[PDB]
Write a protein that binds this ligand. Structure first.
Ligand SMILES: CC(=O)Nc1cc(Nc2cc(NC3CC3)n3ncc(C#N)c3n2)ccc1C
Length: 331
C-alpha cells in the first residue's frame, strides 16, 4: 500500500471557497508596465532563475529592486505574480510594484519595493534576545497571513528575510517557490535550501502543507539563538536527514514513517542509524546563552517536529510565552 494522505490542520479549504481565478494561475493574464520607467543602477546579486538589480523609477525618483528572470516556464512566472498580487498589502510581505518586459529581449522583470537590508551574516551577530523575538514575531505575521490566504512560501531562510534594522522593518521576499495549498495535492519535494528542508521533503512525502514553513522557521530560530549557522549541516539531502536525526532522535523519525506509511529510500537504511533525542542544552555555551531561555527552547521544540501535523501553526506560535514582551510592547 502507498502513503497515508494528509490535510492541513488550519486553513484547509480557504482556496476551495475562493473563485477559480484566485489560485488558477495558469489562466492568469499578466498586466505589463512600461520598462522605460526604470533605469538600472547596480547589480545586487543572483538566484537559480534570476539576476537582481537596484533601479530607479524615473517618474517618481523612488528606489526599487528589479528581478530580471532567466528562462522559466510561463506558468511558474504567472504563479509568482499571482501569489504576490494576492498577498499585496499583507503584513511584512514584499510589495510587487510592477511587471515589465524588454521589447527586444522579451525577458520579463519583476519590480519590488526596496528594503535597505543589513546582510544577515553581519546583522545576526549584533541582535539581542529581544531583537530575535521581535523579528521572529514579524515573520510570523507574514506566514500566518500568506497561510490564511491559502499560500505556502516553501523557501523560508535568512536570505529571503530582508531586514532594515534602523527602521525595525522586516519583509518576507522571493515568492518564486511559493504554492497554493489544495487538500489532497501532491507537491514537488525538490524545494527549499538543503539546510532548511523539512523532514517531509527528505523522506519524499508529497502531501505536505503550510507546516513546511514552520520547520524552516525553526531552523532559522535555532541558528539565531545558538549562533550555529547552519543548525542542521547536511552534506546532501540524505545526510541532511541524518543531521536532524542526530538531534531529534531516530525513534520519532521511524514513528513518523510508520504513521504515514512512507516508503523510505534504501540509501537511508544504512546511514540513519540509531540516535537518541538530544536535549537543547548541548547547543548552549557562554557566547550564546544570553539568547537562550526556557521560553526559546520550549518554542523551538514545538516547531522542530518530524510530524508536520504536530508542529505549531504561525498563529499558535504567535501565542507562545516567548513573544509576551513583544505583544505587550506592540500595544
Ligand atoms: C528579488 C528576489 O526575489 N530575489 C533576490 C533578491 C536579492 N536581493 C534583494 C536585496 C534587497 N535590498 C538590499 C540591497 C539592500 N531587496 N529589497 C527588497 C527585495 C525584494 N524582493 C530585495 N532583494 C538577491 C537575490 C535574489 C534572487
Amino acid at each position: 500500500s502507498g502513503p497515508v494522505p494528509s490535510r492541513a490542520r488550519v486553513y484547509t479549504d480557504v482556496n476551495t471557497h475562493r473563485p477559480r481565478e484566485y489560485w488558477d494561475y495558469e489562466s492568469h493574464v499578466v498586466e505589463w508596465g512600461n520598462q522605460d520607467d526604470y533605469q538600472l543602477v547596480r547589480k545586487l546579486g543572483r538566484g537559480k532563475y534570476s539576476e537582481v538589480f537596484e533601479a530607479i523609477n524615473i517618474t517618481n525618483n523612488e528606489k526599487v529592486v528589479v528581478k530580471i528572470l532567466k528562462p522559466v516556464k510561463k506558468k511558474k512566472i504567472k504563479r509568482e505574480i499571482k501569489i504576490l498580487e494576492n498577498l499585496r498589502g499583507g503584513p511584512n510581505i514584499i510589495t510587487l510594484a510592477d511587471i515589465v518586459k524588454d521589447p527586444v529581449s522579451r525577458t520579463p522583470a519583476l519590480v519590488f519595493e526596496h528594503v535597505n537590508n543589513t546582510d544577515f551574516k553581519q546583522l545576526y551577530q549584533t541582535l539581542t534576545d529581544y531583537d530575535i523575538r521581535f523579528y521572529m514575531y514579524e515573520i510570523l505575521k507574514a506566514l500566518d497571513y500568506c497561510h490564511s490566504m491559502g499560500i505556502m512560501h516553501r523557501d523560508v531562510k535568512p536570505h529571503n528575510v530582508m531586514i532594515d534594522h534602523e527602521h525595525r522593518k522586516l519583509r518576507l521576499i522571493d515568492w518564486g517557490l511559493a504554492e497554493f495549498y489544495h487538500p489532497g495535492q501532491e507537491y514537488n519535494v525538490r524545494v527549499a535550501s538543503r539546510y532548511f528542508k523539512g523532514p517531509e521533503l527528505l523522506v519524499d512525502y508529497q502531501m505536505y502543507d503550510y507546516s513546511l514553513d514552520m520547520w524552516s522557521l525553526g531552523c532559522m530560530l535555532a541558528s539565531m539563538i545558538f549562533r550555529k549557522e547552519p543548525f542542521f549541516h547536511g552534506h546532501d539531502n540524505y545526510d541532511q536527514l541524518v543531521r536532524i536525526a542526530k538531534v531529534l532522535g531516530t525513534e520519532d523519525l521511524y514513528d513518523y514513517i510508520d504513521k504515514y506509511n512512507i516508503e523510505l529510500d534504501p540509501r537511508f537504511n544504512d546511514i540513519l542509524g540509531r540516535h537518541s533525542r538530544k536535549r537543547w542544552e548541548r547547543f548552549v555555551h557562554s557566547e550564546n546563552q544570553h539568547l537562550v531561555s526556557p521560553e526559546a527552547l520550549d518554542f523551538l521544540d514545538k516547531l522542530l517536529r518530524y510530524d508536520h501535523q504536530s508542529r505549531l501553526t504561525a498563529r499558535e506560535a504567535m501565542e507562545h510565552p516567548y513573544f509576551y514582551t513583544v505583544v505587550k510592547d506592540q500595544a
